[PDB]
Every structure is written in C-alpha cells, then in structure tokens.
Subunit: 297 residues, 4 copies
C-alpha cells in the first residue's frame, strides 16, 4: 500500500500518445492545455509535435511552441496497454510514476477514465494516489553487450521456420528443462495477463514477486507453466544438438536471431515501473480482468 513520494513538487510531464489514431487527437489537445495552464513544464515526444494532423490545425499552434531522459518527473499515457510498453522503453533507469488513460478499450495497465480528467490529474499532482511497483526483467544477449528492460514478456520462439525448437533453459546453472515446441514466454507478473496468458499461464497479481516460464504449444503434454522466485538468474541458450535457430522478441520489439553461441540471461530488474491506480491495487486488477479478458463471464 505504498502511497506516493514527490519530495519536490512536480514540474516536468512527459505526455505519450499511442499515435496513428484520430480518436486520440482531440483529447490530446484538451489535456495539454490544462497541463500547460498550470506552471508545469510539458515534455512531448519529438515526432509527435510534427505530425501532419497536429501541424495542420493552426488553432492548437498557440501552445505547440511551449513544448520541449533524466528530468521527467511524471508520465501521462494515452492508450491501452500499448503505450506503457513504449514508456518503459524510453526509461531504462528509474522510471517516474506513470498514469495511463483508456479511451475506449480498457486494458490491464490503464485504470483511469478520461471523464473528469481535470479533477483526477489535480489529485495526482497535489494529493497522494496509490501505486503498484510493477516488476521488470533485465535481459542480456551475449554474442560470440546489449541490455534490455522488459515489462510484459520476453519470447524465445521459432521465427520463419517449420521445425520444432530445441532450446535449453538454465536456472542458476542448474538446467531444468529443454522446451520443445514453438517457444517460451518468460514474463513478469504484469505480463501474466499478456500474451503469456494465451499460452495457458495462470494470472498473477502484480504484487507477487516472481518470474513465470510458460511454453508456446509444448510438445510434451505434461509441461506446465511454472513460476520461479523473483531473485533467480535465468539463462536460455540453444541446445547444441538442435537444427535451425530461434528468434527472441522483447515486448513485441526488435527481433534478433540467436544461434548455437548466443545466450540470453534474465534477472528481475532493480528499477520497477510505478503505475498509479484509480481505487487500489487489488480492486482495479480484478475489475480489469472481468472488463477486458472476461475472467468470470
């Protein structure tokens, strides 16, 4: 039940929109006006302020000139479960608190509703609103060097190919299983409702410190989606007696092939992602399950 900690009053706001959506153009204008109305410096993505849709409207040009890594104090995200992934990408270090709004479809990371947004934003800036310290994974891909921070899942699966994958999974140098099938969806508790859920994984509340291992259509019918303690060091590498190679993805981002020499190491990060909740960590998660994924209906 961590409430909040500002230390110094907020002054920098990084507003990130899902883009490529006309429906989000108009609500973006209203929020920026109110945020700019208060004595708060507003950061917006560099590419966002130069789209033809935002450039054509000369009415909004009044505040466009007042826009502007390590000085962001608070993040506002527009969009459902596709924007918070991008927010974590720009912050490999300590990411500030993130408040996500759902305009239409409601996701697992977007509790706040857009109606009466002025009152909700003022409460976060002035008052205290409860947060969930969501866990993240740091993955290192060693080539025979390149870290990543992953919020939902890292997937090691067969890319363009036909043969079943044969990749070995190590847990603290104590090789546990060799998964044969499409792949594995090693994931955080936040990703338990993500693509990992489609593979038969159980749904973990984001306050449970753990790392999940879930196959994608395993060949063995007794292979279950285990979950391991948070502080363990994983290591996934191709088995030496295995034809064809495998591809790795990071929250639906850059895909790079791993061969008989490359190894990926997974460990829980020390820089969590705080997401603000509208009511409380427990009720919002269960409300999200029913409204989005139909947990009980």
């Amino acid at each position: 039940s961590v409430r909040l900690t500002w230390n110094k009053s907020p002054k920098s706001v990084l507003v990130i929109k899902k883009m490529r959506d006309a429906s989000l153009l108009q609500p973006f204008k209203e929020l920026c006006t109110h945020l700019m109305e208060e004595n708060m410096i507003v950061y917006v993505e560099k590419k966002v302020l130069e789209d033809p849709a935002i450039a054509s409207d000369e009415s909004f040009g009044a505040v466009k000139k007042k826009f502007t890594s390590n000085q962001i104090d608070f993040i506002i995200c527009l969009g459902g479960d596709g924007t918070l992934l991008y927010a974590s990408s720009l912050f490999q270090g300590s990411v500030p608190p993130v408040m996500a709004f759902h305009l239409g479809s409601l996701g697992f990371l977007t509790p706040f509703s857009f109606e009466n947004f002025q009152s909700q934003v003022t409460q976060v800036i002035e008052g205290n609103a409860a947060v969930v310290l969501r866990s993240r994974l740091k993955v290192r891909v060693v080539k025979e060097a390149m870290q990543y921070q992953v919020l939902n899942e890292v997937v090691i699966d067969r890319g363009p190919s036909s043969y079943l994958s044969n990749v070995d999974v190590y847990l603290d140098g104590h090789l546990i299983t060799t998964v044969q099938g499409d792949g594995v969806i090693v994931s955080t508790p936040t990703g338990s409702t993500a693509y990992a859920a489609a593979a038969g994984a159980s749904m973990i509340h984001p306050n449970v410190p753990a790392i999940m291992i879930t196959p994608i259509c395993p060949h063995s019918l007794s292979f279950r989606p285990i979950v391991v303690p948070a502080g363990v060091e994983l290591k996934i590498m191709l088995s030496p007696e295995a034809r064809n190679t495998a591809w790795v993805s990071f929250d639906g981002r850059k895909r790079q092939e791993i061969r008989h020499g490359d190894s990926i190491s997974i460990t829980t990060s020390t820089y969590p992602l705080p997401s603000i909740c509208v009511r409380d960590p427990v009720s919002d998660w269960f409300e999200s399950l029913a409204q989005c994924l139909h947990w009980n209906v």
Copy 2:
C-alpha cells in the same frame, strides 16, 4: 473392421525412406533384397538411388539395377514424416501403406522391424487390419491449387509479427473470428500431431469428424471444437485487418494469403489406409502410451 481386398496379387511396391539417416541404410538394403527375392516389381524414389552412400557401396549395385496409378502397395521407413511424404506424392486413391519404426515410434508406424520378413509375407499373402484415415481437400483461391492434407492445415502469423484476425466460415455462416497465433484445422489423425500441442483432444482415427483448434487464442473461453466430417469449411482474412496470414499444409510449401484469398476445407473421398499390427484400436492406445505418454 475391413481386412483387405487385393483383387489381383500385388506386383508393385513403392518404398520411401525417411532419408538423411545413415542408420536407415542397412535395413533398407535388407528389405529391398528381400522384396527383390520375390517376383515383385520394386519402385523406389528416383532421387533416392543417387545418394553418395548408396553409390559408394558397390555391393548393393547388384540389386540397384532392378529398381524402377501404378503402385499397389506402399512400404514406409521413418517416423511420422514418411507417411506425410507418401500422402503428398499420392493425391488420388493411395494404396495401402505399411510403416516401420526404426527406433522412435510414432502414431502412424505400428510395425516393428524385428522379423520383418514374416510380417511382410503376412501382409502380402494374408489379410491384416487397416485404418481408413481421413484426409482434407483444401483449395486455395486467388483473386486453382488443391492439396490433400493428412495431419493438419495451419493458418498462422508467419514471417511477421502482431496478432491475427482471420474469419472462419462453416457452411456459409461465420461461426467465429479467431484472434491469436492461428488455427490448426486438422483430421483425426492429426489430433496427436501439432494440433495436440495447442490443447486439442485426442480423436481416434475411426471417428469421422473435422477438428478446429486455435494456437494461443486471445480469449480464455475459446475451446477446440470438432465438426461433422461432411462439412464445407472456408477460412479467409477479416476485412478489418492489415497484416496478412500464412498457410501451411503438413509442414510444406507456405504461401501468404491476403484480403482476396480464401481457403476451403472439405473431407476427402480418397482416404489413406494404414495397416495395423494388432487391431485398429489397441495400436492407437499403445502409440498414445509410449509415443506420447498418454498416462
């Protein structure tokens, strides 16, 4: 349980080897010598009799010369892939197929290689039980190309990313729109194939039905369904989708399907008969036990 009907005594044998396996050389040589001992014409794949392993061994050159709608009986070597190749090579009325498992045992390879001469003589002379395995007549129409599929036809997100939105029409009615990795519409014989890894139930090959199984569906309440055999399926991309989908036929040629393309699936009239070592039922459960660890 239909046994056998030769009409005329067998004279042509088509032997397919799994290939790319040195362990299959000597048993193949022994079987070919035994078959050539009898007055039976032996057909072997043309590109099989040109490998460096089969060319270097000059001892086998004594019988190498005697090789060669004209096949009466099929002998298969390999596990669960050789019968796929045989079905691919025979788009019409495929003759009876007998499969031998040399090491690993599959769902389509009941016969053991020990005392192979006696088993082959019994199959040729006597009557042995068969399973008339069903196949699918998939037709892909472009904005023209039929295939016969024994295990499964898969429509999934191929060399690309992002979710999939493809519509499934059954007898002209949109039954469902599957979102996820894809769908594994398959025969009962494929119920133990990759369709099984996606959560499908295990259907005995004497059940006349067609299965529909998703690959990691987005909705938690979307269970595999099985539909009557004599149904006409039709899978095509949803109009409100951007990324195209890729279709595979038993792990064979993959072709991307765009908005204007549709695939139609219907039970074939040319089944694949596979001879059983003991009976059509017990062999399936034995294969489930050892091959797949059913319990």
Copy 3:
C-alpha cells in the same frame, strides 16, 4: 431433416420444469392452444396437482381435458430434456424445447409467437438433430439405463483418490486416478464434461467421449472413441474404498469390487427440433450460453 409424421399427430406430452412460478402462466397459454386443436394432450399426472395450479379456478376449465406419445413439448433449460429422455427408454418421439429466460444447448425455440412455431412443427416439416444416447448396463455380483448427456463415475460420500480401470473391447486402456471420469455423448460435451476440459463436439459426430475429472497425471487428456465401441468400467482390484456412479444427475449407486458398468451407444436416438438448422443453432448456443467467442 425430412421429417415425416406418417399419421398426423394426435398425442402431445408436455413436460414442465416444475418448481417455478415463472413457468406457470406460459404453461396455461400453450395448453389452451394445444387443446384448441383436435389433439389429445398428455401431461404428467403429478403436474396437475400443485396448489398454484389448483388455486387458479380460471384454468380449471381445461384441466379436466388433460390425460402412445407422438410428439413432446418441453419447457425449461437443459433440465427438462434430460427428464424427457428418462420417461422414454425406447423410441422417443421428436422433442421441441422452449427456453423462457435462460437459453440452453437443448432449447432452440423462443417462446415469442409460439402459436406460429408450433403450427409449423405440427403441419410442416422441420429440421431435427438425432442426439446420441448410451445404453448403460450395471451388473452386480441387472439395471439398464439410457443416458443423454453423461454417466459419471466418481467418489461420493467419501474423500479419497480413485483407482478404477477402463476397459475398451477387453483391451483396458487406462486406470484413471483422480476424481473420476465423465464418459459422455456429444450432446454432453457442452455440460459437466466441458467443465473438465473436454473439447466441444457437434451433436452430428458419432463418437463417445472419455473425460477425466482432475486427473492426477498432468499428461492425461480427454479422448473420444468410435461410437460403436463397448466400454466397460470397473474398480481396480488393488484399490481401497469404492466409487459412485451417476446418470445425468439421477440415482447414485455405489459400485464395489464385483460391480461392472458397460457403456454402448444406443440404437434409440433423441430427435430434437432446431429452429433454423442443425449447425448454426449449435454455434449460436455456444456464444449465447457458454461464451465460446467472447
């Protein structure tokens, strides 16, 4: 599918779900219309004795005209058609099931404009689904049953694992260990069998399902076998305690070491009339009731 009455229908057997006030008034409207035509109406003798139906003197006018079955009309959801099969161990006549409120897998017909729908079934030809049933025979150290949805062998007033052997043509296939088994017809694939992880089978597939209840082994999945097979389930000799058998949520009887149960597809199917077609009715039922898509 090409329904022929041979002789025009004259006997109608109406079964109500009972213990439901909401079904009292709709029952009155249908019986008046059915009695309006020159058609003998059969109703269960215990139906016309409830205080609710006796108190209303207005309906007493046609109560006397109630009373070899040619056609069956059912009211209720997924619980009435099971009772309809119970009274007919032989050739059950076609059954038309109405849903008032909740919609089930056995009840396609909507109660609105029931007069037009009933007249079409009586006069015109409608489409039917020949639902498969199981001839279950229990032999002690003989009681024969007909089961439409499922026969379940599981622990009852006790709490321990189960070790029961499943024989298939004398070639015992597995010893299921866990809660039990839900051997069932395709019509029961949208029932308690489905709650155990069974795939949903269209009722035109002629096969028999075997679905465990919480099996102890992780790699043990529901199987479906050809319809014409003879199943035989009996307790394993090296197993303590006993198991209990249920027939569509009906009488339970304990089976001990010497008792065996034999299951075989019946030769007397249950014809259920569909509103549009055998296929699209089933898929609509999946979405509206079991949420197969959402």
Copy 4:
C-alpha cells in the same frame, strides 16, 4: 541465504512414521536405535508403540522402553507424513526432514541410503531449508487451523455450488462448479495441480486460488499476494450446503451463516533440502508428476 541456526544442540527428536506399511517397519527400527545411540532423547507418538507388529517383535523391545518441546522432526513416508507433522504443531514447527522409502514426493528430498551419514550432517552441520508457507484458517459459525497444502471448499455428499469469494472485503468472484481449492505454493503440486493450477516454487510468497471444474470456460486460476485476507462464504441464493476440507482432515459443513477466512500464517514449516532448494524442487517434478517427460 539462511541455512540453519540450532542455537542449542538438538536433544529431542520426534519420529513419525507413515504407518500402515510393512515395508516401513524394518527401517523404523534401524533409525531409532541409531538416534537413541547418541545422547539424544527420542519422542514417538504414543499410539505408534502399540501395534501388533511392534509388540510382537521382541528383538526391538530393548529400546522400546526408552521412547518418551520437540527440537527436530524426522518423517518417514511420501507427501502424506508432513501433513500429519503440521497438524501436531500449530505454533512454531521445528525443522522437518523427510525420507522417501520407495515413492518420491515433493516434501521428501532425502534418500534412505547411507542414512547415518546424512543424519550426522543435519545434527552437527548446517543444511539448507525451505521456509514453506502455511495458511491460518478460521471458520466462524472460532476453530482455527494451520494448513500446509490446501483448503478445499467443494460439494460433498450432495449433487453445482454457488459460493462467494471475498478479497479484503471486495467480492472478487463467485465460483460455480465443484468448488475452490485455495492452496499454498507447496500445495501447487498437490491436488491443486490436478485442477489446472500452475506449479509455484515454494520460495514465492503468494496464495493461489484455483477452481475445481468451473462452469465457465474462461476462469483461470489466480494467485494473489501472500499478505492478503481471504474470506469465502455461501451466496445468499442457491441454498445448498457446501463442505470444507483441510488437507483431507475433518470435513465440516458450511451453511448460510458460516464464513471461512484465510491468511498466510506467521509460523512457516522449515523442510530441510537435500542439496539446494531450487534444484531439489525441479528433481521432484521429473519423478513425481513427470514434468516434461
């Protein structure tokens, strides 16, 4: 990485046997003689030393008199003995070492071969342990229970079940079906696994909620933070009694006014690992339930 802290050298040992097995009769004699050989008091259940098998054998009568606050627990049997060990210790339970004579379970890491050398290491040296979580359960009609594997609320001698589940005062779900199998991470490999639950390592501090054959096709097992307050009670509608079981112990009947509350206990069960907590758990998966062939 805490391993063990005896503080005071062990002097009291409670040896509990799975019983009802002739194969376990002989190994029981060997261990008790060796444990009594060292200057260490041995406790045995009072009903154990009265069976015809133990009374008839006059050879073992030499030390039968010397049997008699427990400092260390030795268990014989597979996955059925530590449940009995938890029952006798509702407070702080001492370290528990379990031997698998034949069948290999999840709470029984130690093998009986070269037992004497293994016993000396535990008494003298330090061995790694798993602080397994337990659930304190209150049934209010205030009879508490401590549960190691699972508490099950399911239909019993009857024929669906409509029972409500509350989490910190909020109705999270209403489960319809056979019932709910709320369990600890140690119970994830127990009958909770047969219900479709994922397999949780016993070092993950969480509480699992899993249905038993739920009516809805989409009702996935959920796992919640350890320090949360569960409260399960019958729905006001669908008046039919449900039954509650605690690791297969006394099955009670819950009516409309009965409530069951589940929270993580503050008295864990320390089970001694054989080589290390991580590798031992994966070894048990391969042999017991054949996880990935």
